[PDB]
Amino acid sequence: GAIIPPWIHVPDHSRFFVIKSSSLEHVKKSFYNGIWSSTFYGNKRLSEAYESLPQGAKIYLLFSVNASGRFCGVAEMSSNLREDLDTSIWGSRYRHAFKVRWIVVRDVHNRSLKQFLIPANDMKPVTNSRDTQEIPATISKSILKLFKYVQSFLDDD
RNA sequence: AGGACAU
Questions:
Q1: Under 8 Å between Cβ of A143 and A116
Q2: For the YTH domain, which residue ranges apply (predicted)?
């Protein structure tokens, strides 16, 4: 069931964010529907980072369900925030969303990531990040290595 | 605290 691409090419000047979800099902809806949405402030943060990118660069989203003990996949932003997308799939609180392109669907346990300490987050491990916590690039590429190296939320389908 | 942090 997992989706693990042979390579991930990360364009220079790209940025990386932890995405958290209170629900595995919202994540699945993201995969099938190619959209995601964050909080009021979370969206503002992602929207601003996405607008700021030099041309080739991307924004990577590393997904993790709350209290799940793992990360479960990787997506890119493929649009800025829009209003004309179908946010009814989340029922509410997420009135805007942006397009995402899924790259990796695979579980990676927190155990395997708790070595990566985030300097701008008081040296806390990446596994202890809030939604839209930014990750430095060199640390991110190491994490991406772990994603491409087996369970997935696409198995019971 | 108008924010989908860990065991």
A1: yes
A2: 14-147
Nucleotide nearest to A37 (CA to C1'): B4
For residue A145, what is the enclosing H or E element?
helix A137-147
Q: How was this structure determined?
A: X-ray
Q: After which residues is chain A broken (C to N over 2.5 A)?
A: 91, 149
Q: How far is the CA of A55 from the C1' of B5 (A)?
A: 32
Q: Which of A43, A33, A48, A4 is nearest to A99 (CA)?
A: A33
Residue A140 Cα distances to A28, A56, A102, angstroms: 23, 18, 17
Nucleotides in chain B with any atom closer than 7 Å to protein CB: 2-7
Q: Homologous superfamily of A1-157 in CATH? A: ph1033 like domains (3.10.590.10)
- Domain coordinates of chain A in residue numbers? 1-157
At how many Å resolution was this determined? 2.7
